[PDB]
């Protein structure tokens, strides 16, 4: 029982995290096969036009890559979106079975927060609709990766680049594509605020029912809001449109509560409450993906 933010185990990632130093700039990289990926501003602080010229003017020996003290020699430079791809003279025997995947809105992933090429801590983040994360990042953490672990292997989805006003964090996938409408430049970037993720809130409400907190649903006569009706309300109250998830079939099977009851509860609880806590809170929590809740709950039919 109980509900916590679950971080994927880090052993596979720790064996790929490296330090990349080029000049005064210090940040982190990802060692896979015979190449290292790190943010492009390792070259320096430049503008879209300048990145190609900075890479051209660079020398392979100016990049110093360390994995647990051992030097990795660069044998090739390349730009991959907002990332630098440095071919190295040694193949990472610790390269896991992995895929580069794009995190989708509402997904959780784990941040391997690193400094000087050493993971110092892990936490879970949630991809918001505007492509930003509510992370915890200090100077030197650029190049920290976000990842998931499946039965098929490691899934690298994120590399950290920048901090935005209001303790908001942005980055790219491992193809160097930024997740939001921001850029890796020292410029004031005010980005649209993120609506609350309705799908995730449904998962959190189910997790409450799984843990004997059903006052919001059982306490009232069965109250229901259709998906169509809810989507219209959410559009004008700062909530995302409901998106279904396979986990809801499992959750309603174990709890007897339908999605439509949860949507009605969301409308009822949208402004917060004070009757009783729900998983220790008095406001809806949108930070738990359905996958995160499902790995903390049991199926009951089979």
Short mmCIF file of C-alpha atoms in Angstrom, two decimals:
data_model
loop_
_atom_site.label_atom_id
_atom_site.label_comp_id
_atom_site.label_asym_id
_atom_site.label_seq_id
_atom_site.Cartn_x
_atom_site.Cartn_y
_atom_site.Cartn_z
CA UNK A 1 0.00 0.00 0.00
CA UNK A 2 0.95 3.69 -0.23
CA UNK A 3 1.73 6.03 -3.12
CA UNK A 4 5.18 7.52 -3.78
CA UNK A 5 6.94 9.05 -6.75
CA UNK A 6 8.92 6.13 -8.18
CA UNK A 7 12.33 6.67 -9.73
CA UNK A 8 13.61 4.08 -12.16
CA UNK A 9 16.73 2.28 -10.88
CA UNK A 10 19.85 4.08 -12.04
CA UNK A 11 22.54 1.39 -12.39
CA UNK A 12 22.39 1.29 -16.20
CA UNK A 13 22.42 5.09 -16.48
CA UNK A 14 25.28 5.55 -13.99
CA UNK A 15 27.48 3.46 -16.30
CA UNK A 16 26.84 5.90 -19.17
CA UNK A 17 27.10 9.29 -17.41
CA UNK A 18 30.31 11.18 -18.19
CA UNK A 19 31.78 14.65 -17.70
CA UNK A 20 32.48 16.91 -20.67
CA UNK A 21 34.77 19.93 -20.24
CA UNK A 22 35.66 22.33 -23.10
CA UNK A 23 37.18 25.55 -21.78
CA UNK A 24 35.59 27.12 -18.70
CA UNK A 25 32.29 25.37 -19.52
CA UNK A 26 31.63 22.19 -17.50
CA UNK A 27 28.65 19.86 -17.97
CA UNK A 28 27.60 16.21 -18.38
CA UNK A 29 27.27 13.78 -21.27
CA UNK A 30 25.87 10.37 -22.18
CA UNK A 31 28.23 7.60 -23.33
CA UNK A 32 26.57 5.09 -25.67
CA UNK A 33 28.42 2.78 -28.08
CA UNK A 34 31.44 4.81 -29.32
CA UNK A 35 30.02 8.35 -28.93
CA UNK A 36 29.11 10.86 -26.23
CA UNK A 37 26.05 13.13 -26.31
CA UNK A 38 26.00 16.45 -24.44
CA UNK A 39 24.34 19.86 -24.84
CA UNK A 40 25.78 21.96 -27.65
CA UNK A 41 26.51 24.98 -25.49
CA UNK A 42 29.57 23.02 -24.30
CA UNK A 43 31.08 24.76 -27.33
CA UNK A 44 30.15 28.04 -25.66
CA UNK A 45 27.28 30.52 -25.45
CA UNK A 46 26.30 31.12 -29.08
CA UNK A 47 23.30 31.84 -31.31
CA UNK A 48 21.53 29.62 -33.83
CA UNK A 49 23.64 31.04 -36.64
CA UNK A 50 26.90 30.55 -34.72
CA UNK A 51 26.61 26.87 -33.71
CA UNK A 52 27.84 25.55 -37.06
CA UNK A 53 30.79 27.97 -37.05
CA UNK A 54 31.67 27.16 -33.43
CA UNK A 55 31.75 23.44 -34.22
CA UNK A 56 33.87 24.16 -37.31
CA UNK A 57 36.38 26.22 -35.31
CA UNK A 58 36.66 23.56 -32.57
CA UNK A 59 39.41 20.97 -32.06
CA UNK A 60 38.70 17.38 -31.02
CA UNK A 61 41.38 17.59 -28.32
CA UNK A 62 39.74 20.57 -26.59
CA UNK A 63 36.98 18.24 -25.35
CA UNK A 64 37.90 16.27 -22.22
CA UNK A 65 35.53 13.40 -21.40
CA UNK A 66 35.91 11.47 -18.13
CA UNK A 67 34.02 8.35 -17.04
CA UNK A 68 34.99 7.65 -13.43
CA UNK A 69 38.42 9.18 -13.98
CA UNK A 70 39.29 7.53 -17.30
CA UNK A 71 39.80 9.82 -20.28
CA UNK A 72 37.73 9.23 -23.40
CA UNK A 73 39.36 10.48 -26.60
CA UNK A 74 37.21 12.30 -29.15
CA UNK A 75 37.73 11.18 -32.76
CA UNK A 76 34.82 13.06 -34.37
CA UNK A 77 32.52 16.06 -33.89
CA UNK A 78 28.93 16.47 -35.00
CA UNK A 79 25.85 18.56 -34.27
CA UNK A 80 22.56 16.73 -33.70
CA UNK A 81 19.96 19.40 -33.07
CA UNK A 82 20.75 21.07 -29.75
CA UNK A 83 23.23 18.28 -28.93
CA UNK A 84 26.87 17.65 -29.72
CA UNK A 85 27.74 14.08 -30.73
CA UNK A 86 31.38 13.26 -29.95
CA UNK A 87 32.69 9.99 -31.37
CA UNK A 88 35.16 8.56 -28.87
CA UNK A 89 38.08 6.14 -29.21
CA UNK A 90 36.56 3.56 -26.81
CA UNK A 91 33.27 1.66 -26.94
CA UNK A 92 31.19 1.67 -23.75
CA UNK A 93 31.00 -1.98 -22.74
CA UNK A 94 28.30 -0.83 -20.29
CA UNK A 95 26.00 0.35 -23.07
CA UNK A 96 22.60 -1.19 -22.24
CA UNK A 97 19.80 -2.28 -24.53
CA UNK A 98 18.19 1.11 -25.04
CA UNK A 99 15.96 3.23 -27.25
CA UNK A 100 15.82 6.97 -27.75
CA UNK A 101 12.17 7.85 -27.21
CA UNK A 102 10.22 11.09 -27.01
CA UNK A 103 8.42 11.64 -23.73
CA UNK A 104 4.76 12.48 -24.23
CA UNK A 105 2.76 15.05 -22.29
CA UNK A 106 1.90 13.74 -18.83
CA UNK A 107 4.56 11.02 -18.85
CA UNK A 108 6.86 10.62 -15.88
CA UNK A 109 10.54 10.00 -16.25
CA UNK A 110 13.49 9.87 -13.87
CA UNK A 111 16.16 12.59 -13.82
CA UNK A 112 19.70 11.40 -13.10
CA UNK A 113 20.87 14.74 -11.76
CA UNK A 114 24.62 14.85 -12.31
CA UNK A 115 27.53 17.14 -11.53
CA UNK A 116 31.09 16.66 -12.79
CA UNK A 117 29.92 13.51 -14.55
CA UNK A 118 28.75 11.86 -11.32
CA UNK A 119 25.06 11.29 -10.59
CA UNK A 120 24.40 13.00 -7.25
CA UNK A 121 20.65 12.35 -6.97
CA UNK A 122 17.53 11.08 -8.69
CA UNK A 123 13.94 12.30 -8.81
CA UNK A 124 10.88 11.97 -11.01
CA UNK A 125 9.52 14.72 -13.25
CA UNK A 126 6.36 15.10 -15.33
CA UNK A 127 6.35 16.50 -18.85
CA UNK A 128 3.99 19.49 -18.91
CA UNK A 129 1.95 20.61 -21.91
CA UNK A 130 4.35 23.51 -22.60
CA UNK A 131 7.32 21.12 -22.77
CA UNK A 132 8.86 22.06 -19.40
CA UNK A 133 9.61 20.20 -16.17
CA UNK A 134 9.45 21.14 -12.50
CA UNK A 135 12.93 19.89 -11.69
CA UNK A 136 15.79 20.55 -9.28
CA UNK A 137 18.92 21.68 -11.11
CA UNK A 138 21.95 23.68 -10.03
CA UNK A 139 24.85 25.03 -12.04
CA UNK A 140 26.80 22.19 -13.62
CA UNK A 141 23.78 19.92 -14.07
CA UNK A 142 23.40 20.51 -17.84
CA UNK A 143 23.55 17.26 -19.76
CA UNK A 144 21.80 15.35 -17.01
CA UNK A 145 19.52 12.79 -18.66
CA UNK A 146 15.95 11.73 -17.97
CA UNK A 147 15.22 8.08 -18.55
CA UNK A 148 12.81 5.20 -18.05
CA UNK A 149 13.45 1.51 -17.55
CA UNK A 150 11.27 -1.14 -19.17
CA UNK A 151 11.52 -4.89 -19.56
CA UNK A 152 12.98 -4.13 -23.02
CA UNK A 153 15.81 -1.95 -21.67
CA UNK A 154 16.70 1.65 -20.91
CA UNK A 155 14.70 4.44 -22.53
CA UNK A 156 16.54 7.77 -22.82
CA UNK A 157 14.01 10.57 -23.29
CA UNK A 158 15.57 13.78 -21.95
CA UNK A 159 18.77 15.78 -21.63
CA UNK A 160 18.74 18.94 -19.54
CA UNK A 161 19.72 22.30 -21.02
CA UNK A 162 18.26 25.33 -19.33
CA UNK A 163 16.30 27.00 -16.58
CA UNK A 164 13.35 29.29 -17.25
CA UNK A 165 11.56 31.85 -15.08
CA UNK A 166 9.77 30.36 -12.10
CA UNK A 167 11.85 27.25 -11.35
CA UNK A 168 10.89 25.78 -14.71
CA UNK A 169 13.31 23.56 -16.60
CA UNK A 170 13.67 22.77 -20.28
CA UNK A 171 15.65 20.38 -22.39
CA UNK A 172 15.77 18.22 -25.47
CA UNK A 173 15.29 14.60 -26.38
CA UNK A 174 18.34 12.58 -27.37
CA UNK A 175 17.84 13.66 -30.99
CA UNK A 176 18.52 17.24 -29.90
CA UNK A 177 14.91 18.40 -30.35
CA UNK A 178 13.72 20.83 -27.68
CA UNK A 179 10.64 19.67 -25.81
CA UNK A 180 9.12 23.15 -25.64
CA UNK A 181 9.07 26.48 -27.43
CA UNK A 182 12.37 27.62 -25.94
CA UNK A 183 16.00 27.74 -27.02
CA UNK A 184 19.40 27.27 -25.38
CA UNK A 185 20.20 30.98 -25.21
CA UNK A 186 20.62 33.64 -22.50
CA UNK A 187 17.37 35.38 -23.39
CA UNK A 188 14.22 36.09 -21.40
CA UNK A 189 11.79 33.36 -22.43
CA UNK A 190 8.32 33.69 -20.93
CA UNK A 191 6.35 30.60 -21.93
CA UNK A 192 2.62 29.88 -21.68
CA UNK A 193 1.65 28.39 -18.31
CA UNK A 194 0.81 24.69 -18.28
CA UNK A 195 -2.76 23.46 -17.68
CA UNK A 196 -3.29 20.73 -15.12
CA UNK A 197 -3.12 17.24 -16.61
CA UNK A 198 -6.60 15.74 -16.22
CA UNK A 199 -5.53 12.22 -17.23
CA UNK A 200 -2.86 12.13 -14.52
CA UNK A 201 -5.29 13.49 -11.93
CA UNK A 202 -7.67 10.62 -12.72
CA UNK A 203 -4.83 8.18 -12.04
CA UNK A 204 -4.08 9.91 -8.72
CA UNK A 205 -7.75 9.77 -7.71
CA UNK A 206 -7.81 6.04 -8.49
CA UNK A 207 -4.64 5.63 -6.40
CA UNK A 208 -6.53 7.29 -3.56
CA UNK A 209 -9.38 4.76 -3.92
CA UNK A 210 -6.85 1.92 -4.04
CA UNK A 211 -5.70 3.18 -0.62
CA UNK A 212 -9.13 3.44 1.06
CA UNK A 213 -9.61 7.15 0.30
CA UNK A 214 -12.87 7.27 -1.65
CA UNK A 215 -14.83 9.98 0.18
CA UNK A 216 -14.97 12.17 -2.94
CA UNK A 217 -16.69 9.37 -4.93
CA UNK A 218 -18.48 7.15 -2.41
CA UNK A 219 -19.56 10.04 -0.17
CA UNK A 220 -21.92 11.43 -2.80
CA UNK A 221 -24.76 9.90 -4.80
CA UNK A 222 -23.17 8.63 -7.97
CA UNK A 223 -22.18 11.82 -9.80
CA UNK A 224 -21.02 11.51 -13.39
CA UNK A 225 -19.55 13.71 -16.11
CA UNK A 226 -19.22 12.40 -19.65
CA UNK A 227 -15.90 12.61 -21.45
CA UNK A 228 -17.49 15.06 -23.91
CA UNK A 229 -18.98 17.17 -21.11
CA UNK A 230 -15.73 17.15 -19.12
CA UNK A 231 -13.58 18.08 -22.11
CA UNK A 232 -15.70 21.18 -22.65
CA UNK A 233 -15.44 22.23 -18.99
CA UNK A 234 -11.69 21.58 -18.88
CA UNK A 235 -11.04 23.65 -21.99
CA UNK A 236 -12.03 26.82 -20.12
CA UNK A 237 -10.84 26.01 -16.57
CA UNK A 238 -7.13 25.33 -17.09
CA UNK A 239 -7.27 21.53 -17.34
CA UNK A 240 -6.14 19.38 -20.22
CA UNK A 241 -8.71 17.44 -22.19
CA UNK A 242 -9.11 13.95 -20.81
CA UNK A 243 -7.04 11.33 -22.60
CA UNK A 244 -7.77 7.68 -21.96
CA UNK A 245 -5.16 5.23 -20.69
CA UNK A 246 -5.18 1.43 -20.56
CA UNK A 247 -4.38 1.57 -16.83
CA UNK A 248 -7.84 3.00 -16.13
CA UNK A 249 -9.34 -0.34 -17.13
CA UNK A 250 -7.25 -1.97 -14.40
CA UNK A 251 -8.05 0.74 -11.85
CA UNK A 252 -11.82 0.69 -12.34
CA UNK A 253 -11.68 -3.12 -12.26
CA UNK A 254 -10.02 -3.04 -8.84
CA UNK A 255 -12.09 -0.17 -7.42
CA UNK A 256 -15.48 -0.34 -9.15
CA UNK A 257 -15.22 3.40 -9.89
CA UNK A 258 -15.67 4.58 -13.48
CA UNK A 259 -13.72 7.28 -15.29
CA UNK A 260 -16.88 9.39 -15.47
CA UNK A 261 -17.10 9.50 -11.67
CA UNK A 262 -13.48 10.64 -11.51
CA UNK A 263 -14.11 13.37 -14.09
CA UNK A 264 -17.08 14.55 -12.03
CA UNK A 265 -14.86 14.54 -8.94
CA UNK A 266 -12.25 16.62 -10.78
CA UNK A 267 -14.84 19.29 -11.55
CA UNK A 268 -16.04 19.13 -7.94
CA UNK A 269 -12.50 19.35 -6.50
CA UNK A 270 -10.96 21.67 -9.10
CA UNK A 271 -10.74 24.59 -6.65
CA UNK A 272 -9.37 22.45 -3.83
CA UNK A 273 -11.17 21.29 -0.72
CA UNK A 274 -10.98 21.04 3.06
CA UNK A 275 -13.35 18.17 3.93
CA UNK A 276 -10.57 15.59 4.20
CA UNK A 277 -7.14 14.89 2.70
CA UNK A 278 -6.74 12.83 -0.44
CA UNK A 279 -3.35 11.13 -0.23
CA UNK A 280 -2.28 13.86 2.17
CA UNK A 281 -3.32 16.71 -0.14
CA UNK A 282 -6.16 19.21 -0.40
CA UNK A 283 -5.62 20.03 -4.09
CA UNK A 284 -5.62 17.72 -7.09
CA UNK A 285 -2.23 16.20 -7.92
CA UNK A 286 -1.42 15.89 -11.62
CA UNK A 287 2.18 14.68 -11.33
CA UNK A 288 1.53 10.91 -11.30
CA UNK A 289 1.25 9.24 -14.69
CA UNK A 290 -1.05 6.19 -15.01
CA UNK A 291 2.05 4.03 -15.42
CA UNK A 292 3.49 5.30 -12.14
CA UNK A 293 0.27 4.48 -10.27
CA UNK A 294 -0.13 1.10 -11.95
CA UNK A 295 3.29 -0.07 -10.79
CA UNK A 296 2.16 0.65 -7.21
CA UNK A 297 -1.16 -1.22 -7.46
CA UNK A 298 -2.32 -4.82 -7.87
CA UNK A 299 -4.64 -6.38 -10.41
CA UNK A 300 -7.59 -8.16 -8.84
CA UNK A 301 -9.39 -10.01 -11.68
CA UNK A 302 -6.58 -12.45 -12.52
#
